[PDB]
Design a protein around this ligand. Structure first.
Ligand SMILES: Nc1ncnc2c1ncn2[C@@H]1O[C@H](COP(=O)(O)OP(=O)(O)OP(=O)(O)O)[C@@H](O)[C@H]1O
Ligand SMILES: Nc1ncnc2c1ncn2[C@@H]1O[C@H](COP(=O)(O)OP(=O)(O)O)[C@@H](O)[C@H]1O
Ligand SMILES: Nc1ncnc2c1ncn2[C@@H]1O[C@H](COP(=O)(O)OP(=O)(O)O)[C@@H](O)[C@H]1O
Ligand SMILES: [Zn+2]
Lengths: 443, 434, 48, 36, 146, 434
């Protein structure tokens, strides 16, 4: 069965119908004003009205700012793009820092385009060129159509096809008992292989046999396909239909990322507007989430000023555990959250707060009953006391190694002695830092 | 007699992580000594790795230089064994000149997850004795020999073209996957290795196959998840699995692989075996790299990380900021820290015996006493380096068991950092720069 | 281009200047040697 | 087509190069060659 | 008007450096061992891919069962150079449309009795909506990739 | 003759049968306590059991650290790889630093493969090829020592055809390897026309068929590099090889595992044997802290070569740490992984013996009173400076018509070519004019 992450319990923001926040719901506990704020941001995103509105989830390490940013992805659901990142992803060696931001600004916007696929496929039982009873004057014979017999596990039928098909039926080495297909929107015929019925006609033959198709000879579905605008940007920047020397050379060579021009973005914006206006394509604007935003350079921050203002851009979520740090890529310049004051002016900051001990105990209980672990009430009370002495990501994290220790020591649930044994085996940052300072001459 | 390529390295004696079934570590077993607290902790994370139930876990093995941090890791790697991935890197292996520090870590993570697969097959495998055809479409036969049988196949129209385009001859050994029809020469049969007397620029002789000629079976493969990412990066991407040309794989591919591998795992077609990523000397990572680990430890399919580090409260690379271990606090509370403890004389004598057991060396108990003092007045890893040189002086001296006189000889030949530093200061201005 | 004083070196550079093999030359010139074999008779087809 | 050997239901995979009988496995190859 | 057309005298390699001085030639006997001691030999691929000791055991070339590659196609692609790359690529362009049809209309049970993978099932680059087969099959998406 | 290089006189360590140093032997003098230690290192390398074990030669400029490391290579001889590198070679533009270390660690391990080289050469008397129209080719060869018929396989004949060979050409066939060379037309046909565009060569005066037992030396790095990028296979003759430039690339540890598993297969079959060698790192202080932190895996690795480091820096800053002073320019955490052989300054009484050993190597005859003076000026300056004057002094002596160095030649050269400490006075006097 599926393995469990650091966030698998986060199922949503768990808001009331009025948009207020419950003490503990949808796998979250506390942070009520920040969950209420993310409620407003979920309405902001779900409205599709806005571009480049941005929020910064500020607050100390292990206060749930990454959890709330993922809770938003659950409240939106998988139908709209949520594009996660860390500030450190921008440090590509193939492409400039500002262009990696622009790609993530283009991954966070999805087309949702619907089209019919219609195809004729089956084992070909005959090719029967149908002559007309008279040729036209001066010709020995003339064919109005080729009959092709096709079959599948549901049945057989003849198709009547344009005489120009017959060249394609000897370009492909078609012969009766092959299985073939024909795109009804294009009229090109393709060969899949000998049908599996004939796999016993030799002890060996140099072709993979294809299982006899099922469903009717003529097939239809409408299918709704999702592409981000970054998929369109890439497919136009590096074509895949490789029947030319430039494309083969460009496909044998290393598949290097490239600094896509403002012009391609322009031409794609000019075409998807056509297909949204024609009611072919829905647009689903979404979210770009950057965790660890304090890793961006002052060059990257001074690019986000254009990017967050641009009338195309997604909603953007930032997170930062940093205090009054220096802005990366300058020696002196300190700024709150590690983010420049002129970018920090452009973002709606959401304050995230330290947990009180009684919330930590409730979070640890939710982790236990989602990691699959049963724990005694006195052990949980001790584990929340460890949380009080340390941090949430230490105290939560002792649960599994306490479960291994309990299992090995013949018990199907955590008890007091396991939590104090694991705490003796494994240190946290605050206890290890004391051990370093007491030994600093030996390291 | 014959020396294998793999031979006596700095950790060769550890052949596990010596634990009883209750995860109680023995004073000395499986080639490991002492570290009883850190070896319980290593055993507990070794069971966490074997369960695989959870993702993005991490451990930091901290402690002084020469106290077994790489030894616990390279021991745990063998208690885990093969069959589960254990990628080991030094922290400075990720500073590539063709991909970012976050790609080189992403590839290091993805190489530590094993997708197991069942695959059903049939392969024919043997010496082709002769090929025969009619002459007009063509129909023909060919004969296969293996150590147990000589047998003949009726073969189709495209097979005759494939054999004649591939230029097979009598006495070649071949394999074909019948379901795919693809031919493959392995070489010429060893009983045939004389019927030509100058050999074409590549040919190779193989012993003729044995057992059943058309083996029909399912096989299990383990594919590390990174290969599934690389194979999809460009049309012939699999060459980069060896050339290393894996230049920054597009994120749209990796999320498609996660979706497909999760779909296979629900259908039961594959099973995801979580491995370990061991980043030895993790303090070498940049702040931009540690801040990437902060999210990589949250994927629903990250490995278990292990790290080791010698650093005190020390500067994080690429910053002026000082932190425990040279690692940022925002990673250090995701980490769960195991602390190794310096050796007693008792443990130090035990380990120097286990190096002599491994190096195949006899020493006097007077020599172990003097060596243990040296390895306790100066770093353990210097005394571990004296004993090989003591064996080589003892051989040159025509001895057999090394004596105190041979230890004191090597101790006069080869210095440690303290005697080297002191005699350097006694001539200081003759060296360059300070 | 490189000149050399040797009958075999002349053959190696002549063959290179002719285009190194019919396979490699057709592969660049026509896109694959199968597309060269087709090109010669796509001359006669209606919908090549 | 099925294995020459009377007790075997499996399809023909090949034939014996010595005796000419249709066959399906090493087991049927031994059984055939030990009665032809 | 036309460019100024120039032809420098051809670069002169002595008969000696041509006969004795080329490492591709004077070292050819040693170069055979670099080709023989290679895991890309079809023999070694088979010995790793199908003749393992353990049920679970760590084999390279395992991916050659899930890409459509023969061990001799892996060997040829590693040892015949860019010509074998180009022709194998052209054959993979042909095969991509064949794979796309089966991949986008076949949906019963699983590849066998609801278990096992099948050949080609590591080639996921066709599954993208915008891959050239799916794009060619879908005349609206074709027009967005102009 | 070979050119006289800066180390060309050192021919070994010059140890006695007990491993003690002779006072002057094998072109070394003095320096005994390091020479005796290098005796132990030569016995270590010759013993093959060890992997990744390492040595640091530490001491001032002009004290024999490069000379003793080359003396180790001379005591081993050509059969065991010795790979020289400067630490400054690590800074590539095409691959990461921590790859160049791994390439050089893989260059210092040799396979040692035996095969009988088998050459056929002569005028071709006939070519006759024997399915219908192909089987194998009989060829006839002739020389002024006799005639043979060979039985070439069709994959050889494909090369005779590609070489444009016909009856009456002179051919060299290498029967192990299918190296086929046309060598021009046999000059018995040098009148087929009066003037034709073929070189004509005399019928070979040698044997038609030569056997030699030969030994191939091939490093693991040759196996890695010759496999990791798709081979050329494009012996000119194929313009596809023009477009794709053969750049270096980061060969992955995913391939090196298979190369180890294949080398194990061939040395277990006894087709090859292994000669673990030395990697020698001159200027080790020139490595970045990232590279030193990679050696904390590479020196531990159970395959690695023996490693010799050499340094002359004092308590300087570790390259790329921007702050951290450490002995020999090496991090203490690596300085604790190496056996340190300290090296010592020369007295005037050693320097005279060096200048004499240089003189009799460099082709000089020297009068004792000039040699006294090269001794004296060595005491005022450095050993390297005195040695450097010998050829200049000889070259003036030759022009002045004396076949030996005498006082006025060396005393003139001393005033004509300044040493470092003499120039360091001039740059302090004329300071504001530079
Ligand atoms: N004991 C010795 N016997 C013979 N020659 C010596 C000896 N010691 C030094 N030399 C000579 O010193 C010269 C310079 O090389 P040497 O090994 O001294 O350089 P080094 O200073 O130690 O090396 P590096 O410059 O890398 O630090 C060479 O000509 C060498 O032969
Ligand atoms: N409000 C919450 N309710 C429940 N669990 C939470 C909550 N906030 C955080 N967590 C738990 O605490 C961990 C640390 O918080 P997280 O958001 O992941 O780190 P950070 O605050 O540094 O960004 C989470 O991964 C999750 O396990
Ligand atoms: N507990 C141990 N049991 C056996 N060998 C050990 C143990 N601890 C250290 N070693 C050995 O001692 C040496 C130093 O230990 P190592 O783990 O490499 O030090 P470090 O943690 O500083 O890198 C190595 O040769 C190692 O194999
Ligand atoms: Zn039967």
């Amino acid at each position: 069965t599926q393995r469990i992450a650091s966030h698998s319990h986060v199922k949503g923001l768990g808001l009331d119908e009025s948009g207020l926040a419950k003490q503990a719901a949808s796998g979250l506990v506390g942070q009520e004003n920040a969950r209420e704020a993310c409620g407003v941001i979920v309405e902001l995103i779900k409205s599709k009205k806005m571009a480049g509105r941005a929020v910064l989830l500020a607050g100390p390490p292990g206060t749930g700012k990454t959890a709330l940013a993922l809770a938003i992805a659950q409240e939106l659901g998988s139908k709209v793009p949520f594009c996660p990142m860390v500030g450190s992803e921008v440090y590509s060696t193939e492409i400039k820092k500002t262009e990696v931001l622009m790609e993530n600004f283009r991954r966070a916007i999805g087309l949702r385009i619907k089209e019919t696929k219609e195809v004729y496929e089956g084992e070909v039982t005959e090719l029967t060129p149908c002559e007309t009873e008279n040729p036209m004057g001066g010709y020995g014979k003339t064919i109005s159509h080729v009959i092709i017999g096709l079959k599948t596990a549901k049945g057989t039928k003849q198709l009547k096809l344009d005489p120009s098909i017959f060249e394609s039926l000897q370009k492909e080495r078609v012969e009766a008992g092959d299985v073939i297909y024909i795109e009804a929107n294009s009229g090109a015929v393709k060969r899949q292989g000998r049908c599996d019925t004939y796999a016993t006609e030799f002890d060996l033959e140099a072709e993979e046999y294809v299982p006899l198709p099922k469903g009717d000879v003529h097939k239809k579905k409408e299918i709704i396909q999702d592409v981000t605008l970054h998929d369109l940007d890439v497919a136009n920047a590096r074509p895949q239909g490789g029947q030319d020397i430039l494309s083969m050379m460009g496909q044998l060579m290393k598949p290097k990322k490239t600094e896509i021009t403002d012009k391609l973005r322009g031409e794609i914006n000019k075409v998807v507007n056509k297909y949204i206006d024609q009611g072919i394509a829905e647009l689903v604007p979404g979210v770009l989430f950057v965790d660890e935003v304090h890793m961006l350079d002052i060059e990257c921050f001074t690019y986000l000023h254009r990017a967050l203002e641009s009338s195309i851009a997604p909603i953007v979520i930032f997170a930062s555990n940093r205090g009054n740090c220096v802005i990366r890529g300058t020696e002196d310049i300190t700024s709150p959250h590690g983010i420049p004051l002129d970018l920090l002016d452009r973002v709606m900051i959401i304050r995230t707060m330290l947990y009180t001990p009684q919330e930590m105990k409730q979070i640890i209980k939710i982790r236990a009953q989602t990691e699959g672990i049963n724990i005694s009430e006195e052990a949980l009370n001790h584990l929340g006391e460890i949380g009080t002495k340390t941090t949430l990501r230490y105290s939560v994290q002792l649960l599994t190694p306490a479960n291994l220790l309990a299992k090995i020591n013949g018990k199907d649930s955590i008890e007091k002695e396991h939590v104090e044994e694991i705490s003796e085996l494994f240190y946290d940052a605050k206890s290890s830092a004391k051990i370093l300072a007491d030994q600093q001459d030996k390291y | 007699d014959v020396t294998r390529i793999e031979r006596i390295g700095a950790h060769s004696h550890i052949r596990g992580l010596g634990l009883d079934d209750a995860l109680e570590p023995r004073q000395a077993s499986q080639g490991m000594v002492g570290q009883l607290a850190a070896r319980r902790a290593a055993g507990v994370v070794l069971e966490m790795i074997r369960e695989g139930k959870i993702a993005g876990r991490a451990v930091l093995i901290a402690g002084q230089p020469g106290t077994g941090k790489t030894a616990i890791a390279m021991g745990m790697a063998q208690a885990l064994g093969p069959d589960t991935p254990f990628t080991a890197i030094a922290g400075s292996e990720i500073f590539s000149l063709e991909m970012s520090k976050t790609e080189a870590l992403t590839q290091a993570f993805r190489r530590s997850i094993g997708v197991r697969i069942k695959e059903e097959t049939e392969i024919i495998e043997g010496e082709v004795v002769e090929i025969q055809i009619d002459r007009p479409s063509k129909v023909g036969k060919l004969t296969l020999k293996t150590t147990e049988m000589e047998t003949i196949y009726d073969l189709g129209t495209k097979m005759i073209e494939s054999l004649t385009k591939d230029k097979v001859q009598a006495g070649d050994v071949i394999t074909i996957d019948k379901a795919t029809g693809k031919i493959s020469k392995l070489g010429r049969s060893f009983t045939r290795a004389r019927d030509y007397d100058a050999m074409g620029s590549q040919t190779k002789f193989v012993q003729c196959p044995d057992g059943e000629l058309q083996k029909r079976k399912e096989v299990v493969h383990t594919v590390s998840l990174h290969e599934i990412d690389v194979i999809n990066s460009r049309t012939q991407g699999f060459l980069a699995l060896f050339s290393g040309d894996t230049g920054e794989i597009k994120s749209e591919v990796r999320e498609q692989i996660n979706a497909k591998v999760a779909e296979w795992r629900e259908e039961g077609k594959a099973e995801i075996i979580p491995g370990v990523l061991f980043i030895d000397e993790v303090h070498m990572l940049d702040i931009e790299s540690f801040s990437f680990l902060n999210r990589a430890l949250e994927s629903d399919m990250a490995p278990v990380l292990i790290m080791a580090t010698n650093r005190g409260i020390t500067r994080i690379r690429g910053t002026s900021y000082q932190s425990p271990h040279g690692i940022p606090i925002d990673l250090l509370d995701r980490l769960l820290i195991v602390s190794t403890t310096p050796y007693s004389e008792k443990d130090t004598k035990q380990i120097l015996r286990i190096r002599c057991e491994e190096e195949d060396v006899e020493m006097s108990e007077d020599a172990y006493t003097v060596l243990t003092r040296i390895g306790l007045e100066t770093s353990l890893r210097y005394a571990i380096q004296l004993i090989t040189a003591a064996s080589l002086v003892c051989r040159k001296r025509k001895g057999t068991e090394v004596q105190v006189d041979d230890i004191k000889r090597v101790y006069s030949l080869f210095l440690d950092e303290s005697r080297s530093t002191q005699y350097m200061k006694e001539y200081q201005d003759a060296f360059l720069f300070n | 281009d490189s000149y050399c004083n040797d009958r075999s070196a002349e053959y190696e550079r002549r063959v290179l200047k002719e285009g190194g093999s019919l396979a490699a030359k057709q592969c660049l010139l026509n896109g694959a040697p199968e597309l060269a074999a087709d090109w010669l008779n796509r001359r006669s087809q209606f919908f090549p | 087509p099925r294995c020459s050997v009377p007790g075997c239901p499996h399809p023909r995979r090949y034939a014996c190069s010595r005796t000419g009988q249709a066959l399906c496995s090493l087991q049927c190859y031994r059984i055939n060659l030990q009665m032809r | 008007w036309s460019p100024f057309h120039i032809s420098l005298k051809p670069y002169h390699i002595s008969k000696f450096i041509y006969r004795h001085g080329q490492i591709r030639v004077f070292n050819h006997s040693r170069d055979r061992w670099l080709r023989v001691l290679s895991p890309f030999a079809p023999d070694y691929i088979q010995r790793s891919l199908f003749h393992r000791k353990g049920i679970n055991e760590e084999s390279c070339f395992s991916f050659l069962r899930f890409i459509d590659i023969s061990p001799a196609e892996m060997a040829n692609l590693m040892l015949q150079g860019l010509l074998a790359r180009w022709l194998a690529l052209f054959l993979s362009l042909k095969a991509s449309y064949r794979l796309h049809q089966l991949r986008s209309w076949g949906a019963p049970e699983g590849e066998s009795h609801q278990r096992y993978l099948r050949n080609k099932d590591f080639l996921l680059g066709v599954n993208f909506p915008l891959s050239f087969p799916n794009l060619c099959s879908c005349p609206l998406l074709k027009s967005l990739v102009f």
